[PDB]
Amino acid sequence: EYNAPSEIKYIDVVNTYDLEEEASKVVPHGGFNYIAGASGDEWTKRANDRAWKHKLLYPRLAQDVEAPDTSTEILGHKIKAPFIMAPIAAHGLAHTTKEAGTARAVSEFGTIMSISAYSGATFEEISEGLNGGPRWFQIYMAKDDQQNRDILDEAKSDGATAIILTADSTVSGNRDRDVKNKFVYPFGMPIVQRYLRGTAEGMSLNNIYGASKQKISPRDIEEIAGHSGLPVFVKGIQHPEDADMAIKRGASGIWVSNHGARQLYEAPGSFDTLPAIAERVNKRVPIVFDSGVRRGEHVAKALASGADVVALGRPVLFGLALGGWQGAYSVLDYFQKDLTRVMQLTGSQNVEDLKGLDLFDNPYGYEY
Amino acid sequence: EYNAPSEIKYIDVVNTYDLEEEASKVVPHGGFNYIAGASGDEWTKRANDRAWKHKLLYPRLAQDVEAPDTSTEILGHKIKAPFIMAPIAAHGLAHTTKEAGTARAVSEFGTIMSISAYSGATFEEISEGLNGGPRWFQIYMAKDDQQNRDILDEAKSDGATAIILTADSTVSGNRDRDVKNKFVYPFGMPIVQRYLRGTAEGMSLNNIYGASKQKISPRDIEEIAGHSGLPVFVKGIQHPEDADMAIKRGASGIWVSNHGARQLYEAPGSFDTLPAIAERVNKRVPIVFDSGVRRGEHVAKALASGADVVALGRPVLFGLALGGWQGAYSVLDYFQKDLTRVMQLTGSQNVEDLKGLDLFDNPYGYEY
Amino acid sequence: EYNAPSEIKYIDVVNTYDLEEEASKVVPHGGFNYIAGASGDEWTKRANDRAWKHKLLYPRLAQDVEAPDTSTEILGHKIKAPFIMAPIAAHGLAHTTKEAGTARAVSEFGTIMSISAYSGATFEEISEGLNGGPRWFQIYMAKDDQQNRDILDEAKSDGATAIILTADSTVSGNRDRDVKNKFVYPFGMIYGASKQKISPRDIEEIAGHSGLPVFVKGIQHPEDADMAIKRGASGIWVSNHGARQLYEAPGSFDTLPAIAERVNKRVPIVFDSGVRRGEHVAKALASGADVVALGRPVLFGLALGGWQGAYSVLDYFQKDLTRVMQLTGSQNVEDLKGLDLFDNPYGYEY
Amino acid sequence: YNAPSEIKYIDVVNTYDLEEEASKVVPHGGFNYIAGASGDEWTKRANDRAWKHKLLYPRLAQDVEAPDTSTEILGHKIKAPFIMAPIAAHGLAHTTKEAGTARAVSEFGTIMSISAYSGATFEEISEGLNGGPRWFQIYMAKDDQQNRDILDEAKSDGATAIILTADSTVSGNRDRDVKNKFVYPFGMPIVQNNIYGASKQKISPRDIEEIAGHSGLPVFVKGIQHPEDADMAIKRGASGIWVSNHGARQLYEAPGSFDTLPAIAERVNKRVPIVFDSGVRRGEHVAKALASGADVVALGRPVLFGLALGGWQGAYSVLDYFQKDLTRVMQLTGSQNVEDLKGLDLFDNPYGYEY
């Protein structure tokens, strides 16, 4: 029955906040609120957003800066801007073109696609959208070790150059919108189907997580690293000691995230946790940051705070809903141009310059 | 004619906050507002709730955690979760099965019932509900010493294995709702009738507190302990010197509480007072915490901050209003499952692990 | 033309904040807003109110306290509770009985009436209400020395036991309500007619001429407390004029500790600007004040019920403070002065 | 483009009200060009709320009467410690344009800052000024010789200082203008929507050396928020520091301008004068800026709203409002003169705007 939008078009993006209410008009109610909502009464989602006001950028002048360069490299991938696509389940909730739509946007823009293990599209379908573009695969682990070896082998054969272990979802967050909507997936999840008691199609996220592994330990990081022979990111980190644990267990990257506030409730805004994590990582491996990035100023602040790249999520999926691959592309294009302005005004010629920026501490918070 | 709800059934519970509005639909106006309301313009009731955003939980990963155990023990009672029922007067305002209904819920769930001296039900009617389950008796002291000895004897005979002295209500708080509604009890209080010079039934709360003891001193604690031979909690503690006072006077537990913000106004949120009290207590006796617990995240935060258990109040009474014993049971069950999720996500295998959690300090407020 | 309320009745006071809205319905718009309004967009008036949430009271248990005594003494006067009436001219906006109505409430209650030298009522009307009760007189400095000597003499002659010199009003505050309402005070007995160039000698000279103890009123900076005492002020009145004067200044309560620290108990401290609750009286005492002064809530009581309505507000404050003493473990007023307070760095939204 | 043309004195109870009043007489695009700021305007609101961070003390028995607002800056005697900020395109607000503003300013008795993006010629503004003092604000061209030309034509007009605005190498993200598709409805004679783009991006400390080297005049570097930039600009030959965030129209999610001022003033250490702008709306704000290290403030938006409502007379009503508003504040804070204001204690308010 599920009526996702199908129109493909470029969209004007004045800011990404506006994209939420615009997408609400064309995405089915249940799937829309699955995308936009968060745990509890969403205080931690708001904290993700308001955390950006805690550290403020300085305009800098006579900086000898012209035509700032947004390109950077991560684990040997040359990318057009210091952002990648976050792994997000079930893109068919936003658009009929689903993950193949997002992939085409990401590949044509020139950055990395993260593929969710809970994708509604097959590796084949996503691949067609990517048309050779770089991809990282995000695993939600099976309890069965051989099923993990199989999923990993499949992802690597498909072209994955890194594995993302998402470990902050051993059980579902208390997502009140989905409870109240009795939200259930309107389609299957071909990559993890093998460990579900049928198809994801009738099921709640609660029961899908939880078919997944609960008893994740540092051993799983060493094992995934060992088996795949690929660099492994550990995703969902908010406490510095977990970054140290992950690196000691063989991780090649740290991915700071609170899952866009969809997991543990009454936790800090993700940005506030980043400096402590970056201090503990001590440059040993690259850091991806996510959860609340909406503006070029947010990309800059994350890099100035110890991140190497950020990952984008909800705004790209809202762009997807509004215009397919072209809509998603408009959002990526927006972020690149937004960051370019910020770079010029802050005195940053290149991405490495962003990493060195002074930030103004704002002890007053949001209301100032 | 007090028309209290009488239907008995389990209820859903997405969050406890929503229970308040739902119960307002079925509880008479005067009694509902007596349960819901607090002192002054209720700024301190809001402070109780907002204090939970001062200390934030970290999600933790690769912890090596599966199927967390919420069971614990207090003063020798094995309980199924680290929460007990708070002593609350006049449960007949919420539901026709009154205190016997709450007792049945509490006993079936498998935790401790606290019986209010201002119960609308007799020890006998409660005992029927408890069916042998553990109970603690909360006294509001008579001015007459013999009457106290008799109340305590009756409590101990009925099966009480601890006594709670509530000492923060020697006069009533400024409860604006009840003044504006001219609230008065619609039924009697059997346990304390002996000192009311009549029945609680015509009476304002102002005047029932007024009949109880005002000149409580540390000797009262010693005398209750000496007479009953039961461990004594002192309830209402917000200042660390009161913890020292109480222990020196023979108390076997400290119960940190601001009476659900129903007493002194323009005081701190209760959770903000707990660390100073726990430091002062220095593990000499158990600590019970209450005043604003609404979520599994709050149980975890209270324990991480030096409580051994928490006491639940308003949400259980709204639950009783909505479905009698089964509705109250649904609330207890919600808290146990809510805590179980929180334990999985924070890395806590058992209740003692919650007590050692790191908390992120949030110096910004509620508005972040 | 001015049609103040004239009805005389006791009123139920659940809290004093509700009294403003209630009063607005029986007092002419212009006059009502002259009473209620403050400078600029009234951010400092809100600061006076929200400052109370910066220091929070503890409940205290097993304190051996039974029937707290609210009574106290200030420069010789035995009063039933540690609050007095603040000097306000224009009670006539609130009620036909003007300053005489408030004087009667204050006298029957058993505390001190501060009488402005600007009052719309004649002293003889006022003296009827006072019925022997104590009174202090508030003045502004005139530009003309003989006017001052004359007004001072008149105050002494009228039974005054202290002089309150208000010096925070050398020019008016920027009161937007009064400007937008084109409000014109209708009664006889301004900032500009009075003395602008007030110096410490003015206090010395008022101290010399009057036999009486002099309060300096409007203090918010501790250096002015030093200055005043050195000049023969027998008391410090901490006030920001109900936020009707300097805009974008601190809430009055936030200034109290630093001033009390400097005064070092040399002279009594009266605190005002924002008192609405018994909790507020407790908090001001715990922070260094000896008594507080009441303003707006009494005037709203006067609008609603004349002397009886005003008495209902004073009675409210006494019973409110009495609850706060019982629960904080204070047997008496000296106990309030020694209370621990909880620091709330989160402020109003917590 | 239907700019208002009515000339009259106006009532000013406060400058905040002027924004809604002007909205009713200025065309939608132009008005929102003037009123608007970057992003969701959080930093514009920060500019305003920053004033609640440091609070004035009233003071008693201070021996004060008839406060003197007059001061002096770079050899100019002005009647109050404020000047007119350089604002583009005054014809958006009123048909009399920069000449209307220039008249109010000159008649009130302070300094006119002329924007490189003015829609009036030097000669039209000169007529409004009638010999009054003027400073000129340059948006640098990419060609060195054309800057030399502009600076010559400015100097020859009578500019006694040069203001280099260096915080606009590209435009801020002004959502109102994007949504309205704002385009200028008239020319800019001094430099003749993609302007900024044509102007110089790669500004360096060399440029400020070269502007001072070439022109006669003391150079202000405008748009400073970071104390390292004030040091840089002094090292480079600037004779003045102009602390500004361009009224929040440039970098978004940056501090309110007033919160940056003490750190800049400390680093300047009285080496050169400091002009402060971005959010000044009350006499209390002029006071607080001077108490925090500024020598004068620059006024922007309220003056333009005044111009929209009453041409030169409206603009004058605003300048007069600020002068009287400051006078009251001076009386109540115990300040006899401008130097007094610069020594005032401020109460620190760690609580927000919400207190």
Ligand SMILES: Cc1cc2nc3c(=O)[nH]c(=O)nc-3n(C[C@H](O)[C@H](O)[C@H](O)COP(=O)(O)O)c2cc1C
């Ligand atoms: C609709 C939705 C689905 C998501 N699904 C996954 C998932 O399959 N795997 C995963 O690791 N993260 C998932 N995430 C979390 C994202 O990877 C990322 O952490 C989050 O989108 C960042 O927050 P933001 O989009 O608000 O900026 C999901 C997020 C959303 C919005």
Ligand SMILES: Cc1cc2nc3c(=O)[nH]c(=O)nc-3n(C[C@H](O)[C@H](O)[C@H](O)COP(=O)(O)O)c2cc1C
């Ligand atoms: C309706 C109502 C009645 C109460 N009656 C009593 C009482 O009889 N004895 C007592 O010690 N505490 C009483 N309390 C306080 C509770 O024990 C407990 O401190 C409070 O409910 C905790 O706040 P919360 O329910 O908002 O979490 C009462 C609270 C409310 C809600």
Ligand SMILES: Cc1cc2nc3c(=O)[nH]c(=O)nc-3n(C[C@H](O)[C@H](O)[C@H](O)COP(=O)(O)O)c2cc1C
């Ligand atoms: C309407 C009004 C008139 C006032 N008139 C005077 C005045 O006559 N002389 C004086 O010293 N203070 C005057 N005050 C200030 C009061 O004495 C006192 O400082 C103020 O009422 C305290 O603020 P609050 O009433 O909000 O608590 C006046 C205040 C208001 C409300």
Ligand SMILES: Cc1cc2nc3c(=O)[nH]c(=O)nc-3n(C[C@H](O)[C@H](O)[C@H](O)COP(=O)(O)O)c2cc1C
């Ligand atoms: C309509 C508008 C146009 C402006 N044009 C210029 C400009 O041409 N050159 C410049 O240096 N500053 C320009 N500014 C910034 C002002 O010089 C000044 O920094 C700002 O107005 C101060 O903020 P405020 O008006 O909100 O107090 C402009 C500001 C606005 C409001």
